[PDB]
Structure formats: structure tokens, C-alpha cells
Design a protein around this ligand. Structure first.
Ligand SMILES: [Cl-]
Ligand SMILES: [Cl-]
Ligand SMILES: [Mg+2]
Ligand SMILES: [Mg+2]
Ligand SMILES: [Mg+2]
Ligand SMILES: [Mg+2]
Ligand SMILES: [Mg+2]
Ligand SMILES: [Mg+2]
Ligand SMILES: [Mg+2]
Ligand code: NA
Ligand code: NA
Ligand code: NA
Ligand code: NA
Ligand SMILES: [Sr+2]
Ligand SMILES: [Sr+2]
Ligand SMILES: [Sr+2]
Ligand SMILES: [Sr+2]
Ligand SMILES: [Sr+2]
Ligand SMILES: [Sr+2]
Ligand SMILES: [Sr+2]
Lengths: 186, 154, 160, 140, 95
RNA sequence: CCUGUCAAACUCCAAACUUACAGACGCCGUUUGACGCGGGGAUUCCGGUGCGCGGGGUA
RNA sequence: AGUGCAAGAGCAAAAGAUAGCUUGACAGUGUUCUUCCCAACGAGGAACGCUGACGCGAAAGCGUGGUCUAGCGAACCAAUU
RNA sequence: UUAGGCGGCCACAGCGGUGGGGUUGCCUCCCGUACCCAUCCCGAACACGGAAGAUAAGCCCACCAGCGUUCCGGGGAGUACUGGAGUGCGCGAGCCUCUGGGAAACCCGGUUCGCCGCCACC
């Protein structure tokens, strides 16, 4: 911008959306990337592969299409993230994808976080992904227990649109139950 | 189709320039060859530009030179209409001359040596130290200029 | 030392001060003469001294010619005459001299010169239609102190 | 339009630039939360050749902690127009700096797709003196 | 030359054009080539490792295999056949 | 702002040209066997001149 | 800017800074280039592998010393494992 | 792509500026700290939980050329420089002719306020 000699960062760098150094180390595996992302309200998991004119998403799942299988709960929590990973994972298996490397983009590797939940979900779907068990939240938290107890400290329902009062991780179970099943229209 | 006549000897000429002439089948002073006007050949003549005289000859001129200096790929069999007719895809020299000028064939294709070994220019040439535009004999010529030279060397 | 020793451009450009030390100071006292508070546009006449050959002019020569030129313009128009003259070239080329046979010959630094391509303006004056003949005479004296032949070219001045 | 434009306090940073500390204790009481050590850079003739080593302390307050502090702190100063930043900030004094900004300032503080705040959304000295003065005190 | 190290006289060829300065895009550092493919050799100033001898810059060789992630490229230095170990970052497909 | 100048160890630019690989044409090779490979025998390792480009030096 | 030291070159969510942890400045054996353009020549050097054992990291991955090009030494003999 | 994710090329994409856009949709800002996790001090950030409010930031859509950049026309310029040739010129440094190539600065007028790929989505 200042002159002929000025160096402008690559576009995805200005936009502060792509860590190119991590990207490179990621691509060095030769495997597909399980692109785990999250929004204030949603969570998205994509299986991306390298292409001539750009990346190629072979399969993917969004927390939105989770309802499509019987989900009346919010979509920005742990149970949401895990199930979304599993959904994307299952679809990945469908398209012939068998292994991946977790790409958490610009999110932090916080133990028990959602990007890791997406990963645990994707792994259960039968996908082979290099991981570390002691960095994944404990089963119960994945189910959504942590939020149930929070609702126990009631006085005012945690959720506005009455999905339920004391909330239900058992719903998480019903949905995972529905996904791990064969039938399911992926 | 341009006619190429070497007018300057090999002593002291760049080797890559001398090899170019040889690739164009000329190995002696006063030897002439006919070259198609292709981009590849164009570069070649442009490279030998200072040691040769070239240009497009007239149908008649070509015919005179062929009758007088054309030779078989091998042997001393004189080349005349009968030779041409009994040995080529043409009826006489004119047919050959025309096909050559129109780049439809080559001397080799018709069993003739690629080279026309001309005679020294009767009455001498315009000198080999200057190009045509400066009164010399080197470089590209008019169809008339080339005809004058080729005929004096018939 | 004869200018025959340095007048030609037969050596690489040698001007890098960061790699050369002991460079003698220039003898050129001023590059802008006359009334330098005024613009050259304010004059009807503009005459330049043009060098006819490419050469190198040692600073000692620029000073002598420039001096014998401006000196005349001062004696003829006054220490404040309404005119202005410029020496547009600066001696950037450092010169040497090998002053022990041809062994370790790289010379020591002895001076500076300005490279002037043929056809260039070495000097340029701006005067009024009156003092036009005085500047032409100042240049006649100047080109007598530099190597090449010169042309005294008159630019804006159709008062012939 | 005005709701997501009306100023607020991002942080109140109390700090004592000493030069060699034992002063942390008072800040810990006048503010309410733990202070932090301050290291220096570059060697200094004034017997300050040690690069990394305690020289000061500061406390950054946000939300209530910040307000509850200013309530009893602001009355201790005589604010002036000069004492204001070109960004809409002011510091008085033991130093007391007040960082003011508009709602979504996070856009420039987050890790993902962060972005610099447009000059239009940047607070102004004028818009700053107002908000503040418009709450328990006077200007110039 | 005054010295004979590997980077002797390589000021130009190993310097980046100002605007190409900075970490290079990962795509060409992960590119895959097949045996027999023609590849132009050119060191990328921004990439430290996987380089070949600067003297070879400008060669167009033939991939004949791999050694780890690096490629073994066949070239002819003058009249001498040589094998060069080089990473994709410093290679480009011909045509 | 305007106005006067530069760079062998400066470069926002930038040739001619040199150069890797390939295709085409040319030339050449498959009884004159090219290209390549193995082996025998050397001589040679004071060079010079013109032209082009130089670096040193008043030359 | 910094990055130990010449010069030229490389580097910005880093190759720089701070903090923490750690000993890959590891063992075995190669490929290739360099040394020595072309074109044979040793020591030395570098890039890139396989095997073993490890460090850190969620993991991809990084680590065969210091971002790159200087910091080096035959046979005989001695000491050492 | 009525606002999304991962990218390729890496300023034609930068700098600056104007206008337009969102009731259970999207992205955000935004609300809030029991948990996982977090600040050498701060739920600021990171992380988690969430919808009262908002389109003012961001973002997306439409657009402006003043600066920077890309390409194009016309002029500079077939100039500067240059591969091949010469019993052409010059005391000489050097120049010229023929043949084959051929800039840069700068001015004027246009272009450029990204293009493209995969996935998802009233
Ligand atoms: Cl994200
Ligand atoms: Cl190599
Ligand atoms: Mg015969
Ligand atoms: Mg004559
Ligand atoms: Mg150079
Ligand atoms: Mg001994
Ligand atoms: Mg010992
Ligand atoms: Mg608006
Ligand atoms: Mg003469
Ligand atoms: Na401290
Ligand atoms: Na780069
Ligand atoms: Na060796
Ligand atoms: Na907005
Ligand atoms: Sr000389
Ligand atoms: Sr004279
Ligand atoms: Sr050369
Ligand atoms: Sr290294
Ligand atoms: Sr907050
Ligand atoms: Sr003389
Ligand atoms: Sr042309």
C-alpha cells in the first residue's frame, strides 16, 4: 500500500483466517484434514483434501442439520460438537475416507474443548485420527452433564425456548443412538 | 522460396555460422541451394546473412539454373526435360521449377542433389564487403537482383 | 599533472565513498552564480555551453573555466548584474595515480572529475537581450580551459 | 444506533512506576485485586543495568472493579482537556489510566478474523469528555 | 572468485524479489511429482532446507524417485550425469 | 514546494544475449554402426595475434 | 529491530521476544551433491534417507547443534571405549 | 454464498472513502461465569454456557480512483542499448552503415476498489 516495495500478506493472512505455518505442517501428513470450526451458535466439521485449484471438501456436517435427526436442543455446546463430528465422520466413511488429521485452525488446544469433541465424534464414526485421549473431556461432559447440573442451580430455567427445564443429556444419547445406527439417511 | 548462394569462404567465419551453411547443404563458395520460407529456415538464413546472397528468383531464372547446374542424387546423368520427365513427378523443368518456387517439393524429393554448383559470376559480382543497399552483393536481393547474379553464374 | 592522463572514460565508474577514503576536496567554489534568488524563467535569454565530445573534466578544470567565465560576467555586468549562471555537473568520479614498478600498482587517490557525454550542457546562463553577447564571451573563455571543443548554444532567444 | 455506540470502560490500569515493588500492597487494597510486577528493558546509567528485574507494579481493572475504583478515584483528580488522548483516553496522577471504547471493541482483540476498529467507531476526546463528565464530575 | 564456498556469487539468484519476500505458500512445498516428470529446478529464497547446489539453478531434470519426502532428480551437468536431492518447494512442473 | 548532479562493491525497472529441457525443421547415423561403453599408446600442462567484453597501469 | 562474529542472503500468528520444559550437540548405516563447474582426486562439509532410542506437542510435526555460506588435518605411533 | 466454512493465485486483492443489509434463518457484536479451560493481575483474551438487545464495528452487497499496484492505447522511441557483418568515417577516445533484436524514466488517456476452485446454505 505504501509503495512499490511494500509487502502485503497473502489474503487469508490479512483476513486473519489461516495460519499458514500450521497449515503446512498439517498438509505434510498426506492425509485429509478434519477441519473443526465453531461459531457463536454453531459448530462445523469438514473433511478436506488438497486440490489443484484449492481444497476439496469430501464430506461435512453442520450443527444445524443435527435437528434433521431429532435435535430440539441448542447447537453451540459440547453434545452438539461431538454429535456433529460423528455425523461428518459417518459421511466421511461413506465417501471412502478412512483417516484424518485434526485441523483446529485458529482455535486453542484447550483440554476438553469442542474442537476435540468434534474429533472424538469423528473418531467414533470409524475414522482413524492421530489423537490423545487425556486431552478429551470426560464422557459425561460430552453428553452435556455439565449443563444439566448448571440448570440444577435453577431459580430460572437455563434455556429460554423451553426445550426442557432440567435439560437432557439423555437426548444426546438418543441422537447418538440414532447416528451410530445403520439405517440413518446420511 | 529463396535461393542461397555462398559468396564468402569459410576461413575466419564463425563455426556456428559455417555449420549452419553446411546444414543448408552448402559446402563451397558459389554453391547454391533453394530454401522454403519457414520460420525455422528464416532464422538460418538471417544467421548466414553476411556470407551469402539470397532472394526469390523468377520462374525463368530458376529454369535456366536447373537446366544448367541441377544434378542427380548420384551419377553424372545430365538433367534435362527428358531426365526430369523420366525421373520426377513433373513433365519438364518448368513443372519442377514451379513446384519448387511454390514449395510443394524439394530437389532431394525429386532425386536431385540439394545443391546447384554454380560458376563464378561472369563480369564479376558487386563485392563481398558490403550489402546490397550499399552497392555490395551480400544479403537479401530483389527478384531482379537475385536473377542478375544467378544468371551471371549460370 | 596533464589532463591527457584522465580526460578519457577508460575506467570503471569509481564513486563509492563507502569504499574509498582520502578523497581530496573539490576546487569548485560555486555551482550557482549570478542572482540565485531569482528564477531562470525570469530571463528572455538562455545560453548553454555544450560539450562536443564525451570526456572527464577534473574539478581543477571546472573551477578554472567557471571562474574565468563568471569573472567576465562580473567585470561586464557587475558584482550584482541581472543575470545568473549554472555549472550543472559535479565531479563524482574519483581519480588515481600510481606514484615500486608495476607491482601492487593500484593507485592512490589524487582527485575528482565529472563525466560529460558529448552533446550535454556543462554551463547554462540566463540573461537579458542586452548582456547576451557578454555571456557568449564568458563561454568563449570557459571552453578554452576544458579538454573538448564546445558549442555555444542559444536556447530561448529569437532576438537575432 | 446510539446503543451500540455509547461509550464504556474497557479497563482501568492503576500502576506505580518506581525504579527498584514493596508498593504492591497499597495497590492491592485501593483496587481490590492482585497487582503485577513490572520489568524494564535496555540498560540504564542510573544504576539500572539489570534488564529483567522488578521496577514497578500495575493492576488492570475491568467491569465493576474498574467503576467502583473510579468512583472513589476520579474525585481525587482535576481532569482537563489536555489530559485526554486522541483516541478518547485519559490518565491522571501513582498513575491511573482509563481506557474507554465502544461496544464491539472485541473485533480487534479476538484471535480469529480480528480487525482494526474503523476511525468512525473509534472514540473521540470530545465524545470521551462527555461520557465521563456525564457521570460524577467536571471537564477542563 | 575470491573464495570458493557454495554460496559464492549467489547474491542475485538466492535473493527474493521484494514482493515475493516472506514465507512462501505451502501448496508448492507439498506438490507431488511422478517418476519421469520434467521439473525445473529453482531454489526458493524463503525456503532454507531441501535445496540443491546453487550452481544447478535453472536445470530442467527428470524425477526418477524419492528419498523421504525429497525427490531424486536426474540432470546432466555439462556432459556429466548427476542425481539431485531436492524438495518440492524448489521444483516446478515443466509446461 | 521548487531547482542542480551520481554509483564496481545501489536497484522500482530492464534488454540484446547466454543457458536447462522438449517438439518441429535441418543435418547425421543404423554394410561408412552414429550416441554410449571398456581397454592400449601418447603428445601436452613457456604460447602468441586479431576482434568483442574487459580489470590494473599516464602509457 | 532482533537473530553470537565478515559480507551477502533468509526470517513476523517467525527463523525474533518472553516463559516453561528438555538434552536430537543421540547411536548404527546409507543415498546424493560438494570439495574438484564441465572432468579423475583425499580429509573435510552439506542436503536427504532407512534403523535404534528419546524430547516436546492435542496432533500433524519439529529436533541428524547455533537460519545459510568460514571455525579445519593423512599414514606410522600412543592413550582411550 | 439475504451475510457461512476450507482454500488456490498471493496488492488487478493494498491505503483511504460513500451508500445499503438482517423477529424465532446465517455471521457477528452482544449476555453471562456452575462447569472443561484461562489470565506472571484482569471471563480483556483464551475456554465454556447462552439468547434480552443491535445492525453502530466486523462481515456481506453496491460503488468512488485521491495514493499504491496490474495491464492497455497513444507519445517518448524503433530512441537508449545490442547479437552478426564491413578495405565505411575519425589523430584519437570513438562513430557510422547493413542485417536481426529492442528498453527505462516520464506525460496523456483508459483499466484495476480482486479473479478462481471445493463444500454447505431459501
Ligand atoms: Cl473457528
Ligand atoms: Cl545438489
Ligand atoms: Mg555427384
Ligand atoms: Mg571490390
Ligand atoms: Mg551481480
Ligand atoms: Mg610422523
Ligand atoms: Mg588420547
Ligand atoms: Mg451501517
Ligand atoms: Mg582510419
Ligand atoms: Na518481576
Ligand atoms: Na517468499
Ligand atoms: Na567427503
Ligand atoms: Na454491521
Ligand atoms: Sr583502462
Ligand atoms: Sr577546448
Ligand atoms: Sr555471460
Ligand atoms: Sr539448520
Ligand atoms: Sr464481556
Ligand atoms: Sr593525439
Ligand atoms: Sr520488432
Amino acid at each position: 500500500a505504501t509503495g512499490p516495495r511494500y509487502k502485503v500478506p497473502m489474503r487469508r493472512r490479512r483476513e486473519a483466517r489461516t495460519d499458514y505455518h500450521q497449515r503446512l505442517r498439517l498438509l505434510k501428513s498426506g492425509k485429509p484434514r478434519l477441519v473443526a470450526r465453531k461459531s457463536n451458535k454453531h459448530v462445523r466439521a469438514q473433511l478436506v483434501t488438497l486440490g489443484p485449484n484449492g481444497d476439496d471438501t469430501l464430506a461435512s456436517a453442520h450443527s444445524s442439520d443435527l435437528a434433521e435427526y431429532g435435535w430440539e436442543a441448542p447447537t453451540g455446546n459440547m453434545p452438539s460438537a461431538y454429535l456433529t463430528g460423528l455425523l461428518a465422520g459417518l459421511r466421511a466413511q461413506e465417501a471412502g475416507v478412512e483417516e484424518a488429521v485434526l485441523d483446529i485452525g485458529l482455535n486453542s488446544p484447550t483440554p476438553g474443548s469442542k474442537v476435540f469433541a468434534i474429533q472424538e465424534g469423528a473418531i467414533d464414526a470409524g475414522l482413524d485420527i492421530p489423537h490423545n485421549d487425556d486431552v478429551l473431556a470426560d464422557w459425561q461432559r460430552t453428553r452435556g452433564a455439565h449443563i444439566a447440573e448448571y440448570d440444577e442451580q435453577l431459580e430460572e430455567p437455563l434455556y429460554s425456548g423451553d426445550f426442557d427445564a432440567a435439560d437432557l443429556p439423555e437426548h444426546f444419547d438418543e441422537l447418538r443412538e440414532t447416528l451410530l445406527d445403520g439405517d440413518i439417511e446420511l | 522460396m529463396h535461393a542461397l548462394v555462398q559468396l564468402r569462404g569459410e576461413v575466419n567465419m564463425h563455426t556456428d555460422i559455417q555449420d549452419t551453411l553446411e546444414m543448408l547443404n552448402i559446402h563451397h563458395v558459389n554453391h547454391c541451394t533453394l530454401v522454403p520460407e519457414t520460420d525455422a529456415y528464416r532464422g538460418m538464413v538471417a544467421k548466414v546473412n553476411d556470407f551469402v546472397a539470397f532472394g526469390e528468383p523468377s520462374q525463368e531464372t530458376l529454369e535456366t539454373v536447373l537446366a544448367t547446374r541441377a544434378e542427380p542424387l548420384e551419377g553424372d546423368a545430365d538433367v534435362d526435360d527428358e531426365w526430369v520427365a523420366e525421373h520426377t513427378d513433373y513433365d519438364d523443368i518448368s513443372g519442377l521449377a514451379f513446384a519448387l518456387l511454390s514449395e510443394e517439393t524439394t530437389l532431394r524429393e525429386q532425386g536431385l542433389s540439394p545443391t546447384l554448383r554454380l560458376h563464378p559470376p561472369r563480369g564479376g559480382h558487386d563485392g563481398v564487403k558490403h550489402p546490397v543497399k550499399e552497392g555490395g552483393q551480400l544479403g537479401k536481393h530483389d527478384t531482379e537482383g537475385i536473377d542478375d547474379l544467378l544468371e551471371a553464374m549460370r | 599533472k596533464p589532463a591527457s592522463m584522465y580526460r578519457d572514460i577508460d575506467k570503471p565508474a569509481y564513486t563509492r565513498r563507502e569504499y574509498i577514503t582520502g578523497i581530496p576536496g573539490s576546487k569548485i567554489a560555486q555551482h550557482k552564480m549570478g542572482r540565485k534568488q531569482k528564477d531562470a524563467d525570469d530571463y528572455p535569454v538562455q545560453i548553454s555551453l555544450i560539450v562536443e565530445e564525451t570526456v572527464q573534466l577534473r574539478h581543477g578544470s571546472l573551477e578554472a573555466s567557471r571562474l574565468s567565465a563568471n569573472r567576465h560576467l562580473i567585470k561586464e555586468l557587475g558584482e550584482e548584474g541581472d543575470y545568473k549562471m549554472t555549472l550543472r555537473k559535479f565531479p563524482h568520479q574519483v581519480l588515481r595515480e600510481n606514484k615500486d614498478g608495476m607491482r601492487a600498482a593500484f593507485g592512490k587517490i589524487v582527485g575528482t572529475a565529472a563525466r560529460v557525454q558529448a552533446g550535454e550542457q556543462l554551463f547554462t546562463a540566463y540573461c537579458n537581450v542586452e548582456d547576451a553577447e557578454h555571456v557568449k564571451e564568458a563561454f568563449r573563455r570557459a571552453y578554452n580551459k576544458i579538454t573538448p571543443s564546445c558549442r555555444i548554444d542559444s536556447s530561448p532567444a529569437g532576438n537575432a | 444506533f446510539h446503543e451500540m455506540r455509547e461509550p464504556r470502560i474497557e479497563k482501568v490500569v492503576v500502576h506505580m512506576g518506581i525504579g527498584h515493588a514493596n508498593a504492591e500492597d497499597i495497590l492491592g487494597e485501593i483496587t481490590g485485586q492482585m497487582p503485577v510486577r513490572t520489568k524494564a528493558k535496555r540498560t540504564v546509567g542510573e544504576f539500572d543495568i539489570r534488564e529483567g528485574d522488578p521496577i514497578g507494579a500495575k493492576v488492570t481493572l475491568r467491569d465493576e472493579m474498574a467503576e467502583e475504583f473510579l468512583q472513589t478515584a476520579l474525585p481525587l483528580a482535576e481532569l482537563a482537556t489536555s489530559q485526554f488522548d486522541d483516541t478518547g483516553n485519559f490518565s491522571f496522577g501513582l498513575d491511573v489510566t482509563v481506557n474507554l471504547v465502544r461496544p464491539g471493541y472485541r473485533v480487534a482483540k479476538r484471535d480469529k478474523a480480528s480487525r482494526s476498529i474503523p476511525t468512525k467507531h473509534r472514540l473521540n476526546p470530545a465524545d470521551a469528555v462527555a461520557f465521563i463528565e456525564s457521570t460524577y464530575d467536571v471537564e477542563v | 572468485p575470491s573464495s570458493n564456498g557454495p554460496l559464492e556469487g549467489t547474491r542475485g539468484k538466492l535473493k527474493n524479489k521484494p514482493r515475493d519476500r516472506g514465507t512462501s505458500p505451502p501448496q508448492r512445498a507439498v506438490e507431488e511429482f511422478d517418476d519421469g516428470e520434467k521439473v525445473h529446478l529453482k531454489i526458493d529464497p524463503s525456503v532454507p532446507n531441501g535445496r540443491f547446489h546453487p550452481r544447478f539453478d535453472g536445470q530442467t531434470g527428470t524425477v526418477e524417485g524419492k528419498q523421504g519426502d525429497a525427490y531424486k532428480v536426474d540432470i546432466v551437468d555439462g556432459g556429466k550425469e548427476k542425481t539431485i536431492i531436492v524438495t518440492a518447494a524448489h521444483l516446478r512442473r515443466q509446461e
